[PDB]
Amino acid sequence: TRRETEV
Amino acid sequence: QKRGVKVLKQELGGLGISIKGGKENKMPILISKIFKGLAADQTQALYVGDAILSVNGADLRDATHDEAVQALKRAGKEVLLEVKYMREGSAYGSVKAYTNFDAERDALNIETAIKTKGVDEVTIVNILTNRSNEQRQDIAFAYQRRTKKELASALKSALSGHLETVILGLLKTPAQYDASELKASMKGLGTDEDSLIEIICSRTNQELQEINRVYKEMYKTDLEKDIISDTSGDFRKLMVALAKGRRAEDGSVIDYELIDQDARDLYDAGVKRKGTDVPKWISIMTERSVPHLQKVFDRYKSYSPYDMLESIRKEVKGDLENAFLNLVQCIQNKPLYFADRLYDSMKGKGTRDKVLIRIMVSRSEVDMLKIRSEFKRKYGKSLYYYIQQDTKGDYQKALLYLCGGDD
Ligand SMILES: [Ca+2]
Ligand SMILES: [Ca+2]
Ligand SMILES: [Ca+2]
Ligand SMILES: [Ca+2]
Ligand SMILES: [Ca+2]
């Protein structure tokens, strides 16, 4: 999972 | 090194970062992006690849992705991050990351340097030799985005001679450079066994795993198959075994019983008998860990009147001998191995530019500082000094930047 999330 | 960074959230972007991972990805919470012009960018204290360990006291070491997102989104305007760069690297390279890096500005200045009358090689060298390899890839990306042309092709047209060789080598990733150097050593009717030996004997398991993958991606064939085509005999078997990159990893315990047995086996296979049991030498020197083999070669001195290097010279000849000699040096003292190869590349008439360039490019972010120490200790003058006497022009300046300085 290359999962990115902006914060 | 755990460090604390205070970030002030802005209503556009929040922290201005993106994160990757979590425990469900068996990863620590990692900063993936830092948006230009946002909150975390203006701190100039956070780097991509940082592990966020806590947010205003809330521990994130064993947090999932969603747990970290919620903790990072909940935190008020002022945010204290405890971060720790967890990106593995070397502290003994001479080329460090540039501390005010702007990939767009560098790409724009490199475009200006290329288009200027006569080409501004000084600016091109001053930039590319003073950026890390990762930063060069970002410069190459921004260059293609702004000019709509690949950076490597533009520099090949603008540059020539040895300077082109250095600059184009610096632009490849480490695995890409080694793969292309390996392909070059097996091109045409002949074979450059010296260059083939230098790379295969000195690269670690992790480095070789990446070379094997990238080589097939670049040339649509396995590296091992090309080695088999261009080598033969015991030299082929040693090169194929080494290129697999499945050397035993450095364990916690020292296996003294096996150290002694390997030493006797190396002695029985060579100096003690007529001829040589080359398969036994290949097995021991390719399978055992490097710290183990260092102790084996010392214990070998207890049984043999000659040390391992002198034993190789008396037992085998040709490419096989050169392979074993290079391999043992890489095991005993790899920075000294490269220091000696650099010296041989310059000591005599002219310069062996291919070897000099390949070492300065490939070791600049690994162990160039140790290479320099061994060089100055043995030869009395610095590597910097020797490069000065053997090269000239912008080619010289690029190599001096890769050297990193005087000793
Ligand atoms: Ca010029
Ligand atoms: Ca050219
Ligand atoms: Ca060939
Ligand atoms: Ca013998
Ligand atoms: Ca010379």
Author numbering:
A (entry chain C): 143 to 149
B (entry chain A): 109 to 515
From the paper:
PBMs are mostly (though not exclusively) C-terminal, with their COO- implicated in binding, and are classified based on position −2, being respectively Ser/Thr, hydrophobic or acidic in classes 1, 2, and 3 17,18. PDZ-PBM interactions are rather transient and promiscuous. Viral proteins bearing functional PBMs are found notably in HPV and HTLV oncoviruses as well as in HBV, WNV and coronaviruses including MERS or SARS-CoV213,15,23–26.
The structures of HPV35 E6 PBM bound to both SNTB1 and MAGI1_2 resolve their logo differences by revealing the distinctive contributions of Arg residues at p-4 and p-5 of HPV35 E6 in the two complexes. Accordingly, HPV35 E6 binds stronger to MAGI1-2 than to SNTB1.
